[PDB]
Symmetry: C2
């Protein structure tokens, strides 16, 4: 179904635009439908809530970040260094558009069971991103486990930063500390 | 002093009953005041928002667990086992009323600066419970560092449980993994 793919791409694109410009509160169903030039019935049909839309957009965004991140700087680096590199990249992406980030994060954590599959797919993505950041070929099971913990730390610090409980420097320091707590102070 | 504590207690009790019935979106200041048998003005004097309400309630849950902690019961256990026990207790407390937990968590994760004092109190409490569990006593700074990571994992897995991405068993297993990776 190429039509469903084009419509999906549009919906997610408009969601990204609206969230980027106005934040979580700006992401309204009919607004997104209108910026993507779609009908509200079809949008509610494919995405039953703003949470679903924002989490899906988050999914494609993580996937594309992963598929577009130039890793030349850490060619020949150790897994520790490469992991810190990836964490740094995601932190930069976090601090890029704070309204977009607040929107997608808020959708992630305010999600309920109805969006589970979506959220899970995001979680699995970020884990993978960290695991493969450590790996030579396919990650070890422990690299996946380490990535799981790193993703939890990253989530919690993202929440602290969004609510202004922590500064960017606090986030970097805590993530770095977590990494050193998991794979030693290298 | 005593009357104030009575009112505060009644208020948090009402908050938890309402939240247990209908979650975050059901917690309205007026209804809390009503159930609590207090004027809304008095309530606002005690707690400026439903966020302060729910985070204060969460903090009281964790206080009440913390007060019941006796290490003479877990004397023959290892740091790993004591930490996994503590995780078990916190998880039990949260897995009782899913809507209540959802309310307290929702309020806790995105509370603003105005509630920053309560949030801190909850966070420092959880950390201190994990760290002390590691030390079976007053912890080193490093054990607090580790506790902070464990609390991050715990919180993430609470969200996973709430959204039914993970069963209670899955949560236990993932926390077990985290603890193993951090302190073996």
């Amino acid at each position: 179904s190429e039509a469903q793919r084009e419509r999906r791409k549009r919906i997610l694109d408009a969601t990204m635009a609206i969230a980027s410009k106005g934040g979580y509160e700006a992401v309204q169903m009919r607004a997104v439908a209108d910026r993507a030039d779609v009908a509200v019935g079809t949008l509610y049909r494919y995405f039953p809530s703003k949470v679903h839309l924002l989490v899906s957009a988050l999914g494609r965004e993580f996937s594309r970040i992963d598929a577009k991140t130039d890793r030349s700087a850490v060619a020949g680096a150790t897994p520790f260094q490469r992991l810190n590199f990836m964490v740094g990249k995601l932190n930069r992406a976090m601090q890029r558009n704070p309204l977009l980030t607040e929107a997608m994060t808020r959708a992630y954590v305010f999600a309920d069971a109805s969006a589970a599959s979506e959220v899970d797919q995001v979680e699995k993505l970020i884990d993978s991103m960290f695991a493969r950041a450590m790996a030579n070929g396919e990650p070890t099971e422990d690299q996946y486990h380490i990535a799981r913990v790193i993703s939890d730390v990253w989530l919690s610090n993202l929440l602290a930063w969004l609510t202004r409980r922590a500064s960017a420097t606090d986030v970097s320091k805590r993530l770095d500390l977590a990494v050193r707590l998991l794979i030693g102070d290298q």
